Hints:
monomer; alpha/beta; five-stranded parallel sheet; 16% strand
Amino acid sequence: ALSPEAITSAQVFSTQSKETYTYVRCWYRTGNSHDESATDWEWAENPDGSYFTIDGYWWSSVRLKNMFYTNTSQNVIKQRCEETLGVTHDAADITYFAADNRWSYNHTIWTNDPVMQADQINKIVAFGDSLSDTGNIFNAAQWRFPNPDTWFLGHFSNGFVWTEYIAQAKKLPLYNWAVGGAAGSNQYVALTGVKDQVLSYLTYAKMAKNYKPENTLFTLEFGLNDFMNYNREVVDVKTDFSTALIKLTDAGAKNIMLMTLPDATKAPQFKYSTQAEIEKVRAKIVEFNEFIKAQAAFYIIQGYNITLYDTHGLFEQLTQNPQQHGFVNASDACLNINRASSADYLYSHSLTNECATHSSDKYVFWNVTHPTTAVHKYIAEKMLAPGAGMQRFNFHHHHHH
Length: 401
């Protein structure tokens, strides 16, 4: 039950004073396409071949969910990984973490902000569920869920998710607090709800140096995993979501990206479902989407930088006319799964012959519920488009010759 307001300046000083070093684990997709989710890693090296280390300190409130705080930029770390791996395929999709040893978990590396800090967005912080999670439930599941041969290293897709595509387009670090709530995640110990992700984030941000919440772009999507796998009532999801935004804005957040939930009943899982089952899930999404719109409007009135993306509408166009958006199939899972369940995420599956023929980049769905990385990319492109909503955020704004 860690509370950021309980953390003392003495705990802050003691944590930061434990200066040490760690190594960098560089992950990459071994195959040349998004069809193959399998990954491997190597230790980052210096140009001379010696191991690349980073100086800094750890903090957790446990020890296994530890974050490493360094002054080394994300650019320098990524460059070391890119130069060490020597992989040339576009789908290498390199990711990196702090690790002392081969048995260590994948620890997020946080680059501490400088004292001389420009007034603009310098990082993206994500809150959410399996549509945003890049490795939290994976670490909690001891790298077993979602299966790393079928699902891209802790991601609930065959590649990067929408937040990573936005971070890459903006050239900003992405720090993920989203927790995958997909079927079978209940077997693992992790944050329940989006209010607790905000509380957890604030405790880690307390250990950061020169941190200014106004310079963070926060992203928030939640509700689908709760509605579909935990049979949660709308009233409870609304309370959790509302409380998370209250905590976030009360902590000094200024730039927040909100989004409506796509209608999960349009997914292949609901192909043969009764209208009663479809209506029960759809009613919850529709009601929750109207609530998100009112929450967005409320924070706009107060003077916050809010963008609300209609991802529900974007997804409706996609599933209704896939060929109009560069997709061949919006009705079947790309994976060969005949009896859908929690084993979609626990065990490995091959692509159907049909998906291998067209490629996973031409399919909307990876399994019966989760979309492919091409869909995440497509969504990010729509969000990043001129005048689509990114202009409301305090990004760097250049001069004109």
